[PDB]
């Protein structure tokens, strides 16, 4: 048994996080200076939020991490009776730390916490600021109520760009001696959708299945409506060619892809397609309306054909 590459190459220092440079440098500044304030960590999944918070806490606390840090996940109980009984009791606890160190409470995935739990969190954070600090983490920052963001230095994480994912993929490939081709790298990056965890998982899955990393193997392992088929269908919609676009769509339907998957890939490809920007925005709005219909439950081949027709008539 070997650790998965998502955990095998998990960063253990803030220096080896390829995420947002400004926030990473800010976290390193907090680790060096010492007097870190309460911080909120929002961003897309798989960008390094939890890794950054745990690395920061580890660097700050050293050996005192085991008894000075309280890490709570989505799998833990974090109700109103925890922010008031567990969080408060840990905050009141006496830990001897160096001069600029504090007890770090990591409410990881705090967006899952209710409004009442965070209201209980509010001045439990405020009072014990002399002795303990709170490091939140979430995907959506609007899920954290106003006072917590008011009393926290809201750090923002953003999707890893294509180049960052490519550099980390090169590092992992070199350290694992994995055969590859540039087309396979582009396929892995496309299927990653800006998540380093997803990129690593896809690369490891393709290595496990087929060893070699090329686009064919990547899309065999990471099965989704092929970006080339979806791209040429979008191109047919730009040329107002309903028949060819429906040929592609019906081929995708016969392959068994759900309309949700098809429309997701349609949006992904159309987002970075070669169009006049006004026409691209028109296509995005039409795809959004069709996706709203699909999510509402009206998910049939006729809906996708109607989307294709509306895209075709957007160009007249």
């Amino acid at each position: 048994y070997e650790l998965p590459w998502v955990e095998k190459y998990r960063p253990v220092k803030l220096n080896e996080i390829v995420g947002n440079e400004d926030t990473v440098s800010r976290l390193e500044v907090f680790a060096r200076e010492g007097n870190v304030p309460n911080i909120i960590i929002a961003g897309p999944p798989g960008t390094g939020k939890t890794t950054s918070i745990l690395c920061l806490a580890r660097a700050l606390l050293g050996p005192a991490l085991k008894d000075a840090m309280l890490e709570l996940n989505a799998s833990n109980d974090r109700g109103i009776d925890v922010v008031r009984n567990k969080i408060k009791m840990f905050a009141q606890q006496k830990v001897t730390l160096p001069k600029g160190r504090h007890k770090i409470i990591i409410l990881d995935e705090a967006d899952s916490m209710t409004d009442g739990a965070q209201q209980a969190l509010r001045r439990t954070m405020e009072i014990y600021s002399k002795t303990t600090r709170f490091a939140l983490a979430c995907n959506a920052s609007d899920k954290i109520i106003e006072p917590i963001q008011s009393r926290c230095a809201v750090l923002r994480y953003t999707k890893l760009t294509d180049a960052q994912i490519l550099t980390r993929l090169m590092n992992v490939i070199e350290k694992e001696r994995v055969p590859y081709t540039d087309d396979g790298l582009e396929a892995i990056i496309f299927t990653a959708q800006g998540d380093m965890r997803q990129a690593l998982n896809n690369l490891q899955s393709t290595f496990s299945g087929f060893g070699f990393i090329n686009s064919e193997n990547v899309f065999k392992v990471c099965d989704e409506p092929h970006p080339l088929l979806v791209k040429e269908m979008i191109q047919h919609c730009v040329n107002a060619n309903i028949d060819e676009a429906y040929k592609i769509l019906a081929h995708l339907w016969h392959l068994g892809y759900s309309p949700e998957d098809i429309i997701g890939n349609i949006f992904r490809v159309c987002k970075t397609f070669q169009m006049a920007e006004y026409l691209k925005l028109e296509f995005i709005k039409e795809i959004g309306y069709t996706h709203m219909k699909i999510a509402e439950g009206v998910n049939s081949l006729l809906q996708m054909a109607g989307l294709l027709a509306r895209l075709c008539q957007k160009t007249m």
Binding site: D81, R84, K88, A120, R122, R123, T124, K130
Partner: protein
């Protein structure tokens, strides 16, 4: 820290041009209003005005939160003690000032 180091020690450490701390001591002496309340922007010393007025006029202070369990029943006794008993101390320090926080 720095902020609590320079908390208002006496009535003379309050800042001028302030209509809050200059107009509540009129009502707080012993014209028949019962309860108090807060409004306006935060950070204006609404938490420290009561404490420093109690310090200057010779009154004591109490504080409460939603950080502890505010069940409806315990919400009674957490305030009754603050309200209807005197002080087990010298007769000078008997008066008390009460605060309820984070109701919204």
């Amino acid at each position: 820290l720095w902020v609590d180091e320079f908390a208002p020690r006496h009535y003379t450490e309050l800042l001028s041009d302030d209509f809050t701390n200059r107009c509540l001591l009129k009502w707080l002496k012993l014209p028949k209003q019962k309860v108090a309340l807060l409004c306006g922007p935060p950070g204006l010393g609404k938490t420290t005005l009561a404490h420093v007025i109690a310090r200057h006029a010779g009154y004591s202070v109490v504080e409460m939160n939603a950080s502890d369990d505010r069940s409806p029943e315990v919400f009674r006794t957490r305030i009754e003690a603050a309200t209807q008993m005197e002080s087990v101390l010298g007769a000078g320090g008997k008066p008390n000032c009460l605060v309820i926080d984070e109701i919204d």
